[PDB]
């Protein structure tokens with residue numbers, strides 16, 4: 177029993193964090209095999225962040241300008257390239273701690289763990305979600321760029337995110353490990369507003385199933401709804417539309433608890449229309465949307 | 481910017497998790513040097529959990545009855561002893577991954593990370609706090625016993641908790657690494673009610689400072705209070721009394737934000753008396769009490 181905002185164990189990812197310096201800028205890099213991945217803005221002069229032309233800036237850099245440090249030992253940079261908004265620094269040594277890995281680009285609503293790092297050293301780990309506006313509500317300070325977001329299936333680390341920047345609204349933007357940003361964000365110091373932060377409906381539904389499994393049942397009502405009816409209510413409350421795919425994905429939780437997905441939607445619809453009335457669900461006073469149906473099943477069954 | 485419920489990186493602790501089996505019971509153990517620490521209830525027959533006499537049960541066990549497995553390899557048990565409610569299984573091999581460590585007994589209000597494990601394998605990591613009633617609101621299922629709670633100062637892991645049991649109210653009880661339980665809990669299947677779960681006032685104050693640092697300032701008011709006045713209000717709302725030590729501990733946050741501790745107490749007093757009025761603080765609709773002043777400073781400054 178009990179439901180915590182749980183992150184994957186970070187050990188496998190800790191073994192990949194290195195420090196990357198270019199000139200006087202220092203950020204984190206991800207060392208997998210003989211390649212160090214880092215944000216390309218490491219090459220920017222701190223007084224040309226408004227309008228950088230990365231291809232031009234990169235002409236002034238050589239392999240020897242990128243200082244890669246794993247722990248207290250220096251790695252030899254034998255090659256460098258720019259792929260979208262990341263730099264790939266080929267080193268002369270394969271990381272002896274490289275776990276089994278994949279690079280995956282996630283969809284909004286999907287969750288992941290972030291290992292926040294400063295100067296190649298991990299300082300903390302927490303759970304995140306790719307928001308429907310392609311931002312992440314992370315916890316990052318200056319020098320956290322290059323920290324990665326990941327998921328783990330048994331022994332395989334699926335790298336999904338690398339931190340690049342903070343939007344003026346205190347939210348975060350970054351790329352997948354191929355250097356492509358999530359959403360419309362660009363690695364430049366410019367006016368970039370985030371879009372509407374809608375609630376991830378399927379995740380709220382999953383967390384209501386987690387609450388039922390763990391004993392919190394006061395919100396279970398006598399009503400049901402249809403996908404179209406619920407979606408009208410969800411639209412009004414800036415919730416993501418619920419699709420038949422989400423219903424199918426919620427199937428195992430519906431089966432375990434005996435509560436039909438559409439009955440839980442009606443329970444959610446009443447919580448939206450009436451509020452919590454001073455009550456709590458899994459120790460929270462708001463509807464939690466950063467647990468996917470997969471995370472709920474994993475946590476509630478103990479997938480290691 | 482951004483404030484997440486952050487846990488310490490778990491890698492150092494992952495390298496210590498082993499599987500411990502006695503008869504047909506399987507739980508987790510902590511392997512530090514040539515010793516494996518686990519809850520003593522591993523020796524209980526699943527049909528003598530109501531009234532166990534551990535000294536008597538232990539007479540029927542030998543070194544060869546405790547099966548310790550690190551990964552897929554078996555460790556040789558050359559000795560076994562009972563210290564309070566933990567068993568110390570001396571093995572013939574020192575753990576090659578043993579980090580720098582200490583065993584510390586924490587006070588209520590103190591926070592720590594938990595690496596939830598099943599069959600010696602870590603499945604997740606999350607942040608916890610020792611509640612003022614000596615329970616922890618963890619996330620543990622059957623077979624999670626032996627999972628540990630810890631803090632890390634640079635390279636030193638301070639082990640503070642080992643999970644032993646779930647109280648009927650879905651909350652959790654466990655020991656420090658010397659086998660002494662936090663609170664009045666006993667390792668037996670009996671009627672054990674938790675006490676009042678009061679709110680950790682100093683931690684709420686610290687998290688209000690974290691909110692001010694990160695931009696959420698709507699709750700800052702024009703009032704101040706005294707320690708005695710605030711404590712009357714705190715008493716009414718089942719909040720821990722605020723002492724002068726807590727004020728001193730909040731000193732660095734008070735200095736960084738320019739908000740005197742007693743002014744923040746008056747801000748808290750108004751939040752208690754009036755509620756959030758539908759508003760949020762750091763993405764939360766309730767007053768968060770599981771961030772110590774130390775955790776706020778660490779997170780806000782980036783201590784790795």
Ligand SMILES: *CCC(=O)N(c1ccc([C@H](C)OC)cc1)[C@@H](C(=O)Nc1ccc(OC)cc1C)c1cccnc1
Pocket residue numbers: 203217220224225228316317318319320321322340341342343344363364365366367368481
């Ligand atoms: C790793 C460097 C860093 O911390 N930041 C950063 C990132 C990118 C640049 C520019 C875009 O590339 C040359 C500079 C610095 C922080 C950051 O993104 N800062 C920032 C905040 C707000 C605005 O508004 C226009 C612009 C910028 C660049 C950063 C701080 C905290 C957390 N994550 C990143």
Ligand SMILES: *CCC(=O)N(c1ccc([C@H](C)OC)cc1)[C@@H](C(=O)Nc1ccc(OC)cc1C)c1cccnc1
Pocket residue numbers: 177507521524528529532620621622623624625626644645646647648667668669670671672
């Ligand atoms: C590791 C074993 C386990 O999961 N549990 C457990 C722990 C201790 C015993 C007894 C006390 O010692 C022989 C048996 C099992 C779970 C647990 O504590 N179960 C439990 C729940 C409620 C009550 O009410 C009286 C009693 C017991 C024993 C456990 C489940 C989930 C999380 N953590 C522990």
